[PDB]
Amino acid sequence: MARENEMDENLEQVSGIIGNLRHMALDMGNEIDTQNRQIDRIMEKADSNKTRIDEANQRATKML
Amino acid sequence: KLGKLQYSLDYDFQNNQLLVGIIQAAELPALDMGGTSDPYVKVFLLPDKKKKFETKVHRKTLNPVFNEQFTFKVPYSELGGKTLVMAVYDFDRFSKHDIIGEFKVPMNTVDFGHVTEEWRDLQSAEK
Amino acid sequence: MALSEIETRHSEIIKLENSIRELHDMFMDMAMLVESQGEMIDRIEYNVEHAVDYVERAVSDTKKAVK
Amino acid sequence: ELEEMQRRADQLADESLESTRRMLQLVEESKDAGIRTLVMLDEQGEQLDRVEEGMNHINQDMKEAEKNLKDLG
């Protein structure tokens, strides 16, 4: 039974570690989502400023 | 110049109520003696000034963290023409609590569906 | 019990080991992708800061030009 | 037949045991990989924040530049 119990302990530890892995996976995924939303925001603003600076550069070189 | 404000905004369609979360604020100007102010944020629906919500008073920090939440039981149809007001106040025990800043958010510019959470620069309240 | 019980035990255990291994590989790939994307973000922030400098100097120049 | 059977059973026991040990090792590697992954996420997150502040600054500066060009025209 020592063979079996030893293994039992192993499976229990694996269980705990798996639970922790679950929590970590949840935090991971959530923060990944939020960061994705933030990146979307960044690309919106970056395109806005791209247009801004293109138009501004054209207007600036226009008076030359 | 006072500082910025991080807040959260989203709408619960299951209970038909607005969920406004006050996360924190940063780089607030100091108005008190110690070199730091005692800030607290008053939040209320912009359209009608009724049932205004106030956060807990934080002592002597120019970067207060409230992490609080408020619920406005308002239908989704009325919501569109309703604005949100978040004003930062400075607490003083022996005088009028001076307003540090304020911020207004139109609910027609707000997009619900994804949980919103952003930093916005504070401005000086109108006389 | 019998040999059937032990065999099924062994089988389900191996199944668990393989599922575990797939989980592992997923985590490894995760770390990898996140790292590479990290380098990507490095160069992005680089380009952005350069852009900020250029814009600032440009704004100063125009601001001195108009007046 | 019988001896080989008992030995077979004990064999399967040992195999399952070392298998579970392998599992423990694997979930440990997974654990650490996950941790460093989260660390990377924090770092890159702050970097993204700095990027956002950069974008805001760019926007305001170009707004001013737009003002000056409109005041010059």
Place this chain on the structure above:
Amino acid sequence: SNRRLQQTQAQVDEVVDIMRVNVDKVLERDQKLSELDDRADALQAGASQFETSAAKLKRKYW
């Protein structure tokens, strides 16, 4: 006790189902980051050009 074995198995399966989705979302993040990289390069290029033009204009109207 097969209950613990199968329960742990279910845990593992769940975490797997989490992680594969997380991985796909990460790939999407890689796409968004790549496009942001290109956009940033173009942005700083235009920034340098506008800086040059601004230098000319300052050396013109002052």
Place this chain on the structure above:
Amino acid sequence: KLGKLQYSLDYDFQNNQLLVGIIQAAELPALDMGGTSDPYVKVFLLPDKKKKFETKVHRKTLNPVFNEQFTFKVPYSELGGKTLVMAVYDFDRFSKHDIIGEFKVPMNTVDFGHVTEEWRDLQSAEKEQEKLGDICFSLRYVPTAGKLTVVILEAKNLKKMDVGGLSDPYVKIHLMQNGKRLKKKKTTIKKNTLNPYYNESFSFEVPFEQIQKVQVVVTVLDYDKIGKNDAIGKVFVGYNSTGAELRHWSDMLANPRRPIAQWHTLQVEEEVDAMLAVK
């Protein structure tokens, strides 16, 4: 330097038992008054310390001859992963019996089949840190805003605090300066865990002009409802810190706008608080 020990070892396959014979010892150092000690040998199976066997006490000899025999009823399969321990003790009537020497014999190095009997030199018995626990967290400081982000990640191999079970750990974080405890933070209480996972972030307002004069104190404690809550371990980083702690601190400083995660070994609260009372 104490002396040598002659012993015998063999296995009886007919009764499935281990036959350990204590022959004698030689050149033992004298610890008693007369110029000779009163030696006696304690022998037990190394794997499990159960049913230890002790020889008769010999009076005033530095070359005691026991010629005794002990039997360990242990199967031959279990024997392979079992070690033998033979420790020489000095008898004293009015005090603790000091250990003269000890010797350990791995049963995988032992060859049975021929009756073994050898002389082996005695060595001094081993007396390490008691806690053997570790706490891992990440440090991030950006000098411009003066923000200190301490993220408690996870502890492992913590010392048992509850009776017949695992512990109920929680992390308390103190920020000290000139011996005073300024800020107080704590985490969620994870119950019945050998390795608690928190992943909880804390932030502190620390100016750039005082960064070299601050103390960050991380303490892992156990939680019982009733009575005083004891403490498992604690470590500190920052001002007047040494070891891997000062290293992690210097990594936090050298790497701004970036969090560095690291492990740390838990020390006793007495020594740590003694270090914090300095300057």
Place this chain on the structure above:
Amino acid sequence: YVPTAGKLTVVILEAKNLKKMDVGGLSDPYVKIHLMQNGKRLKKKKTTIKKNTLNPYYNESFSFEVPFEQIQKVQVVVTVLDYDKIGKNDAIGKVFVGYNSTGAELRHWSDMLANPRRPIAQWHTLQVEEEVDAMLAVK
């Protein structure tokens, strides 16, 4: 220090620029040497009292029995004090070398270790007793 015999020879040579302890005049300095371990003060030695001096010269040798197995776990505490007959005798300064020592002190110690059967002379800056004793209460 010679490791074989386990002899530690501390020769107090001379102090300089000591802080004034007497009213409207120079000080009356004398050197007290303590040998500490685990916070306990084992041996106590002192020197002759040189009266009215800005820079006291002693040239006095002291010896201590220190085994080679405990050389890395010993504390040598040198204290310069002022002597008045009446009342408590105050303290001017003190420094310590050995276990848990830092600076030029640990350097001098390491020079003593690296150079056996040979005496190495060195200067040391006097610290306040509070900080030093706070350092000695460690471990």
